[PDB]
Amino acid sequence: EFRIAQDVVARENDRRASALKEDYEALGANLARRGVDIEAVTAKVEKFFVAVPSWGVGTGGTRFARFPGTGEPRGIFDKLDDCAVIQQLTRATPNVSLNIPWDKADPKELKARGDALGLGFDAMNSNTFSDAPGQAHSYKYGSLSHTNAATRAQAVEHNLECIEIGKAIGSKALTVWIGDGSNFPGQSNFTRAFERYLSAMAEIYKGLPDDWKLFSEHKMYEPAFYSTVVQDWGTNYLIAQTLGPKAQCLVDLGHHAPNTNIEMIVARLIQFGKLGGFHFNDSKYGDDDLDAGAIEPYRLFLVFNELVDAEARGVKGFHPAHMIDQSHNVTDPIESLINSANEIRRAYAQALLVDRAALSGYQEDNDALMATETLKRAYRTDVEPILAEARRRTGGAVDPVATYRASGYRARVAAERPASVAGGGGIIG
Amino acid sequence: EFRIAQDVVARENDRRASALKEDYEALGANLARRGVDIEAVTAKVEKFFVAVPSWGVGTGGTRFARFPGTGEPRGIFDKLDDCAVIQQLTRATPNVSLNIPWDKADPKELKARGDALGLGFDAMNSNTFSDAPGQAHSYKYGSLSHTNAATRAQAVEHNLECIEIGKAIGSKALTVWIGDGSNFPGQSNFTRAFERYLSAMAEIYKGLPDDWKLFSEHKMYEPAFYSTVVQDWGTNYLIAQTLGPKAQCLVDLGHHAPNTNIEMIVARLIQFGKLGGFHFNDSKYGDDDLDAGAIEPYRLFLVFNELVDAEARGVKGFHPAHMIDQSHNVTDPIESLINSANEIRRAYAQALLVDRAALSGYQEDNDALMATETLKRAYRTDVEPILAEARRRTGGAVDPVATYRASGYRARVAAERPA
Amino acid sequence: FRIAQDVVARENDRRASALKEDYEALGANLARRGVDIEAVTAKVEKFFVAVPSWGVGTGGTRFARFPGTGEPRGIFDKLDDCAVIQQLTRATPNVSLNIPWDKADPKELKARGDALGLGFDAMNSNTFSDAPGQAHSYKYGSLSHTNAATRAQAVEHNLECIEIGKAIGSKALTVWIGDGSNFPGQSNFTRAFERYLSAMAEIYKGLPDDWKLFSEHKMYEPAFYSTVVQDWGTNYLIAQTLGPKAQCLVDLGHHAPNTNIEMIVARLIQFGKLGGFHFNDSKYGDDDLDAGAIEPYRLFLVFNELVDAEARGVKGFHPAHMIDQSHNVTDPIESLINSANEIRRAYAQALLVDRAALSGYQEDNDALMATETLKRAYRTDVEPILAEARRRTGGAVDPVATYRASGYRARVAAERPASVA
Amino acid sequence: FRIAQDVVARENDRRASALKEDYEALGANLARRGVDIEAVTAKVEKFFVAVPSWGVGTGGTRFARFPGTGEPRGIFDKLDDCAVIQQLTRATPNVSLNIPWDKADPKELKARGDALGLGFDAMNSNTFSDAPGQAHSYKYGSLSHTNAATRAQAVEHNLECIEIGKAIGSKALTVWIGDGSNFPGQSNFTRAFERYLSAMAEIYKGLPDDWKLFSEHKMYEPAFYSTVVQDWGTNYLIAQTLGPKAQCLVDLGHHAPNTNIEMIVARLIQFGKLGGFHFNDSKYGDDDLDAGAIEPYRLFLVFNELVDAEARGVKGFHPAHMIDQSHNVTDPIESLINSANEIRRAYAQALLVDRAALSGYQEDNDALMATETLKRAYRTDVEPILAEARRRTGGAVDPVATYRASGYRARVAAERPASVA
Numbered sequence A: 001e002f003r004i005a006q007d008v009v010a011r012e013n014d015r016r017a018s019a020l021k022e023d024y025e026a027l028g029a030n031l032a033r034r035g036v037d038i039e040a041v042t043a044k045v046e047k048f049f050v051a052v053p054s055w056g057v058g059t060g061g062t063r064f065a066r067f068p069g070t071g072e073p074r075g076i077f078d079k080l081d082d083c084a085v086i087q088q089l090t091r092a093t094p095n096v097s098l099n100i101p102w103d104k105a106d107p108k109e110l111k112a113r114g115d116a117l118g119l120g121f122d123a124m125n126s127n128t129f130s131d132a133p134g135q136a137h138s139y140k141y142g143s144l145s146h147t148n149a150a151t152r153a154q155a156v157e158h159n160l161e162c163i164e165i166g167k168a169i170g171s172k173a174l175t176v177w178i179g180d181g182s183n184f185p186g187q188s189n190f191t192r193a194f195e196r197y198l199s200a201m202a203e204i205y206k207g208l209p210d211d212w213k214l215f216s217e218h219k220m221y222e223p224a225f226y227s228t229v230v231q232d233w234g235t236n237y238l239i240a241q242t243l244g245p246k247a248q249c250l251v252d253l254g255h256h257a258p259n260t261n262i263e264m265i266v267a268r269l270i271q272f273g274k275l276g277g278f279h280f281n282d283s284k285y286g287d288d289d290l291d292a293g294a295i296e297p298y299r300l301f302l303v304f305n306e307l308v309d310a311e312a313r314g315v316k317g318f319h320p321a322h323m324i325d326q327s328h329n330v331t332d333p334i335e336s337l338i339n340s341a342n343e344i345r346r347a348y349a350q351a352l353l354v355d356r357a358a359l360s361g362y363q364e365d366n367d368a369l370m371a372t373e374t375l376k377r378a379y380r381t382d383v384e385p386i387l388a389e390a391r392r393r394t395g396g397a398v399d400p401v402a403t404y405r406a407s408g409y410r411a412r413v414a415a416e417r418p419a420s421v422a423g424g425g426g427i428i429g
Numbered sequence B: 001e002f003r004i005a006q007d008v009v010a011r012e013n014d015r016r017a018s019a020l021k022e023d024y025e026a027l028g029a030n031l032a033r034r035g036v037d038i039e040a041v042t043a044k045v046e047k048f049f050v051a052v053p054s055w056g057v058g059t060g061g062t063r064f065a066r067f068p069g070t071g072e073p074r075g076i077f078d079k080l081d082d083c084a085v086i087q088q089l090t091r092a093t094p095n096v097s098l099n100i101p102w103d104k105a106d107p108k109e110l111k112a113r114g115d116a117l118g119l120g121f122d123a124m125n126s127n128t129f130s131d132a133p134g135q136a137h138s139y140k141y142g143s144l145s146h147t148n149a150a151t152r153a154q155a156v157e158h159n160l161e162c163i164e165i166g167k168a169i170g171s172k173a174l175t176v177w178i179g180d181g182s183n184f185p186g187q188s189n190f191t192r193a194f195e196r197y198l199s200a201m202a203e204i205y206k207g208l209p210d211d212w213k214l215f216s217e218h219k220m221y222e223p224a225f226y227s228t229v230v231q232d233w234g235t236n237y238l239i240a241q242t243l244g245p246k247a248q249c250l251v252d253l254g255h256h257a258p259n260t261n262i263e264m265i266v267a268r269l270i271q272f273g274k275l276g277g278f279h280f281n282d283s284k285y286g287d288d289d290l291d292a293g294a295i296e297p298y299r300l301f302l303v304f305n306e307l308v309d310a311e312a313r314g315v316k317g318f319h320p321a322h323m324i325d326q327s328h329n330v331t332d333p334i335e336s337l338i339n340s341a342n343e344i345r346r347a348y349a350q351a352l353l354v355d356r357a358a359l360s361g362y363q364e365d366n367d368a369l370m371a372t373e374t375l376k377r378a379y380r381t382d383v384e385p386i387l388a389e390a391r392r393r394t395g396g397a398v399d400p401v402a403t404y405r406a407s408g409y410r411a412r413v414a415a416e417r418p419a
Numbered sequence C, D: 001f002r003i004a005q006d007v008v009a010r011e012n013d014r015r016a017s018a019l020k021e022d023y024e025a026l027g028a029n030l031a032r033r034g035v036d037i038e039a040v041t042a043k044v045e046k047f048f049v050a051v052p053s054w055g056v057g058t059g060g061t062r063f064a065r066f067p068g069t070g071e072p073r074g075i076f077d078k079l080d081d082c083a084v085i086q087q088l089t090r091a092t093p094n095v096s097l098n099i100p101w102d103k104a105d106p107k108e109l110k111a112r113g114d115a116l117g118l119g120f121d122a123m124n125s126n127t128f129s130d131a132p133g134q135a136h137s138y139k140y141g142s143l144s145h146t147n148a149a150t151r152a153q154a155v156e157h158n159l160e161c162i163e164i165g166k167a168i169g170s171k172a173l174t175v176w177i178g179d180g181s182n183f184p185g186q187s188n189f190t191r192a193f194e195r196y197l198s199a200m201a202e203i204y205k206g207l208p209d210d211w212k213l214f215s216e217h218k219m220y221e222p223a224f225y226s227t228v229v230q231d232w233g234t235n236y237l238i239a240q241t242l243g244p245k246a247q248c249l250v251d252l253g254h255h256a257p258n259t260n261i262e263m264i265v266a267r268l269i270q271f272g273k274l275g276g277f278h279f280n281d282s283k284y285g286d287d288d289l290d291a292g293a294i295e296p297y298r299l300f301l302v303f304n305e306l307v308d309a310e311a312r313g314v315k316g317f318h319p320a321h322m323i324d325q326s327h328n329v330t331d332p333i334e335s336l337i338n339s340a341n342e343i344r345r346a347y348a349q350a351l352l353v354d355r356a357a358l359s360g361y362q363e364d365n366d367a368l369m370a371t372e373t374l375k376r377a378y379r380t381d382v383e384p385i386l387a388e389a390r391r392r393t394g395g396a397v398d399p400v401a402t403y404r405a406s407g408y409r410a411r412v413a414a415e416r417p418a419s420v421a
Ligand SMILES: O=C[C@H](O)[C@H](O)[C@H](O)[C@H](O)CO
Pocket: A055, A099, A125, A177, A217, A219, A252, A279, A287, A325
């Protein structure tokens, strides 16, 4: 299937192939003068992928309000039709992460619907941070770390169910993020709470296929505003080290304390082989979940700088699971995921342009200036031509968001899907 | 009328009377040694009030979920009943802060309900951060500073409506907080948006009654995640200075950047007569909206230190409006509000024990240590006996939450309000 | 007796009647809550925190340093001042030394300590500033410097600190370094850490059987982009890699804005890697302000974790308590005196927590009463206990006051010359 | 000429050919975008940023300082080093002096400056550290000190700074103080601020008609609890209270974590009180790192505000640009060279922003395209424009590379004595 009319793609691409040729040829000539074959970079770029969050093709909100756009996806199947667009146009998101029970549906259908749309399935995402209809036990005071054995068991039961559904759709991992924490001093005993969590997580580990991975994800706060059981990579690490070889750490860029050097944390987890994967997005204040690289692009480059360095240093057995974890509250969800996904590839490409040998040289002789400049020369290089050409050759659009608006897709699904109503967000009932 | 049976309050008070006498008298003995009449403090304490927020009477939540308890208030009228409990037991919340359209109801009836319940109404809170049913223009991209004239006109009109309702219930102020901002660089033109906002607030100021005040409330972020038109007290001051004398700044404790010295911002505003009021709550990470004092009680005391100091220095016409802006996601909203209110009186109480003569002296001699230590001798004093005696003398409960749970009130309203 | 016994006496007498009233009032009040003020005072009496030798002198910032009168000229002077603090508070029997700032003949240090009734806490190495003669500079690092020769020299200095430590009775080595980078790309994170790990292992080898090696993390400063030991997570990896004797030292002001510090303490305790603390208060960065002066509640919440571990019966849990501060605008001695009191104050209040009730409210997810349970403890003015504790052990009911009355500062001011160049 | 003309020429001819390729490529790409590359280059050529006399010397922290070789000592060595920066970058024709640090005979300063091809930017008073002989200490504050005489001394010093300034061609006086407190209660916030506003009025009077007075805010350091001029809010209160000649100065690293700095800029511009900037970068606090070495996009966003100010043709908008960094682990010159380069880059890119389309996407609340419109400019490698601008004005294609080729560091190292060989 083709969510976008192939003629629209070819059309809009042809309307740009002229400029693209110039820019590309000019950049390839520059990189050439720098001992780099723009063709090897491009080659690698077309093969780099990140997963799109199913809960991301819909409009997000805040506790204060939600302002839905038009043609909002009604369910998981609609959401899949949308991601198919992002993939067709960028060729960088051939996989979708699901959230249960949100995208709960007949596995045969999901798998079937994806095969038609040319989409696969990334890591399963359990949900014990909200109560579903008929749920016997509330998650108000926690889930996997709740003081009630029955509630923890139910929480464990859910994650287990998530693994079955994923096993059936082709998923190879389970990411566990919970809001388990406390809003007040004394409310929780940090130790007992964690101990409970570790044990509960241990039972989930048993139900993990032999070729699967369990990813735990840390966050400093929200929904818990005083303490969070899985608050930082430190704790996260302790979890991965305890659970077993199949348990790794998930790093969501916007979940760190103000000014945290996030790229070091990536390196530390890589060092001890516990970097399960990422959750790309950007922010300025807290867990803002903004478009990848929209606020701090250099930071995103520095995170990939560690990733490429490991990739280059022959770090055997290093295939992190990349995913986009964003909330689009004031833009078309599709356009954002499209560009956020491209910004990720931009960062990657620039990281592949760094003179690794020259860098080591400067690090070794403590030449701080040239070291940081060595990185900058790569970051400064406008890799758009490479990202564009990569898309074109793989059958994507030279200019993704442009082709999309020209295809009219939004007005289209908008005419097929019911109208959404703007409402509160959760600060009150 | 009394939401809580008077016989239960009396019972629960006699039960603790003996102890309170012991503690109060020991405290009086201690304070007299420090040359402080415990009586004069109790006298001022039972006169300190702070209004409860209607939107805090029910369980709040986050963008990730909302976990309601039992007997949640069905509407504004339910909320007023629960606010009546809070006032009956603490005698510190004789007023309620409403939000329109959230609490929209017939002014005449709200007024009626309030009078019967012994409650009054504090500043009105306009709501142009969310779309009301039927609304012509969406506030998705802003309100008072929206690029589209029609949307700004609609925003202005909403606030003017808010003024009409409040005039009707005995309210004398309009607090304006908006989420206007941008989530991306370039998405907005900082100055132009601000210019629009000022122009829009100017119109509201124009329709403001002359026995009313206009409070603007700054916030660093949320809902906007890159820029916010009214981001800090700097922008806020510009705003109030421009609008006129009836427009002041409202300080919400959790709306500041990390490590910000908030008490200083409070002094500065008083110095330039632009401190309209507070939105009390506590926090640790962002605008957490936690019970006041539950995270940083000392920070709360320092804010009150500036309030009590202003009165000491002689500042005139300073009567900031005290309000509680909290969200209670995992506790009985009512019990939370009860202690938050008490905690606020606690900070005020201790700030009144500060020997200003001694303090001033150490400041002049640059004796930093004795200076800081002078504040600490006040803050370290357990003033609970004074807070309890004050409630006891004014019809309240020695142990508010204790008497509340003994009333089984929550079980009662949970039966009257199917879930 | 650095302070005349009659001064201490006279001053205690003048305040005896009030201490009696407040103490007995607090005793009654506490008795009503099922707490033995007596049992608390007795425990408070035995809570000791080590004073840093480098804190008894006026500290400064990169912009300036405003010394006071009577600044100590050397380690022996500092010890004399440390004895003033211990005599009056009775909460600081030990002193933490810094090599090479305090380097001196171990036998004289030991003798001056014994004579003053002072012992020596953990030894602190210094490879964050060059010393004269140094064959290699620590500009670009020390234990993790790219140059092996530089790392060797850092390792040697640490072993040397151990030797000095053994002679004066010390039982641990604390290692804090500025090693890091100010520019992205300057250092290869992983490689700099492997180097450090390799260097620390060697130091570990030189540890006595009854010694411990403490690694202290810090988010930034002097490194402004990356610090090798940046947070408790990296710190944990170090403790776990080096061995049983290796633990983590937590300095309150070394964390990112808003970091829940008490949790980290809880985490290290659970995994047996809580070596000790460096107490001090802060508001913006590693301010090193007097403990409890800014956030007294946070201090109490850290101690709540400390007292709870005891309550859970964690075995082999004996963390090293030390005060790590800089006093830039007060009399170093007066600040350390009160900082010591604030900590005993936090500790005291932690002991007043009705944990049986706390455990109840926690299990019942009664968040409000839970938090309220801690507050009942924290809101108690424990000063009478701290003062009575001092009296019974020969300290001053009002330390700073007795110190001012003794004219000590003025005395040492007339005895010590100010540094001119 | 500090650096040899044949070296510059040599290094430039060496890179001139490839520069041509890149430059013509950008002019091409910028043409298909509707931009005249030669228009940008002409403006870039005239973008100047003052160089701090204290920046040419290796910086340090409260823990240590590792001076490099050939350290300039005394204002004269310093001017000689700043001259290297101006010659190779051509973007720093003027120097900011700090009194008393660079105190000397005005006539000789002015004389030495013309000899080197340097002017003198705003004067910088210093009442945050005590100088030898000083009657009163600034330990507890200067312009806001509680002691009248201490404040008179500060006023007078600043006034002296204006006189030194008038004699060398300076037109403004920047006033940054450490004044604040480290403990709650120590200072009475309002009273201290009143004493400061009163003293500042005194200085204001000494300002010539064309002279301006810049006050600089800082969240913390050296004060660790509260600072008199803590934020831009207080700053504004000061500038609008002292008068038309007094404006606010904004040092990028003096803001609370996560603060939106470019917005503060806008707000001040709109109100005619943006006196100028102090460029540098940070990640934690006032790290005072090389501009754009940490968050280059933020530098651009600040500059996007500065450039838009030109277009909207704003009034009273004439910001004094100064670099205020501290180089602790690199050659002070090389750093200042690339910092001044990074600043021009920001400017160059902000200048490529299609204001028309931007404003278009703003009114339509088309946020994604709006942000993408900024990304199109910022994403453009404007180095070819930077090098070309340098080449046309007598600068070097690759400043640091030419600097290194000139072997200048080694030269001054041989002329100036270190502390140790
Ligand atoms: O904040 C929550 C984390 O980003 C999790 O990955 C979460 O599952 C995601 O936001 C979708 O719910």
